[PDB]
Amino acid sequence: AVSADPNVPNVVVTRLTLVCSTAPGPLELDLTGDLESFKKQSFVLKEGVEYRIKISFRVNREIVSGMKYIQHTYRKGVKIDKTDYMVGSYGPRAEEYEFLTPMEEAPKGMLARGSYNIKSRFTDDDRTDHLSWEWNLTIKKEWKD
Numbered sequence: 001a002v003s004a005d006p007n008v009p010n011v012v013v014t015r016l017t018l019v020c021s022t023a024p025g026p027l028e029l030d031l032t033g034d035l036e037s038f039k040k041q042s043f044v045l046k047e048g049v050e051y052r053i054k055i056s057f058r059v060n061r062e063i064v065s066g067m068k069y070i071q072h073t074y075r076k077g078v079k080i081d082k083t084d085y086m087v088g089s090y091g092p093r094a095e096e097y098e099f100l101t102p103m104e105e106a107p108k109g110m111l112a113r114g115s116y117n118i119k120s121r122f123t124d125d126d127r128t129d130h131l132s133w134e135w136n137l138t139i140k141k142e143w144k145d
Contacts, residue, residue, distance in 0.1 A: 006061070009061075009130065009131075010060055010061025010062050010064075011058070011061075011064050011090070012057060012130050012131045013031040013055055013056070013057050013120075013131045014031065014056040014058050014096050015028050015029060015030050015031060015032075015056045016028070016029035016031065016053065016054075016055055016056070016120075016135075017098070018045075018051055018052075018054075019051065019054065020046070020049050020050075022046070022049060022144060023049075023143050023144065024143060024144060026054075027043040029135055035133050038134070038135040038136075039134060039135075039136070041136075042115050042135065042136035042137055042138040043135070043137055044138050044143050045137045045140070046108075046139065046140070047108030047113070047139055047141070048107060048108030050103040051104055051106070052100060052101055052102060052103060052104065053100075054098050054099055054101070055098070055122060056096050056097070056098045057090075057096055057097065057099075057122065057130070058096035059090050059092045059093070059096065060092050060095075061092055063089065063091040064090045064124040064126065064130075065089040065090075065124075065125065065126075066089065066124050066125020066126065067087035067088060067090045067124050067125075068085060068086060068087060068122070068123050068125065069085035069087060069099060069101075069120065070082065070119075070120060070121040070123070071083070071118055071119065072118065072119035072120075073116055074117035074118060074119055075116055079119075085101060106139055107139065108139070113140060114139060115136040115138045117135075118134065118135055118136065119132070120132060120133060
């Protein structure tokens, strides 16, 4: 044989970042080992600040011509917004990359405050789903003001 055996996927969501240029820092959601530790807590978000989201993933085996990112804004148990994000063709170079979603205002309002469960399924246009999990988003008044 040659080198070590595969028996492992080549593309998996390594982490999720949330830059807002206002909060205390980018919320990093690890998605490789402890995945059930996110359903116990949530990321404090602002009423509706325009924040961008960046998904990270390592590719060290084959190219993924058709990387996609999904996210169902589950609210009160019911879905209120879920869509896919066409990324592009990714090839294995040496390490992982970082996707970047444009602005995204959160739900604001005296009632909008609360935890919002989200279903994200990062899949590729090949024949399966690389990885998928679920994290909640707690909206508040001001995390730094």
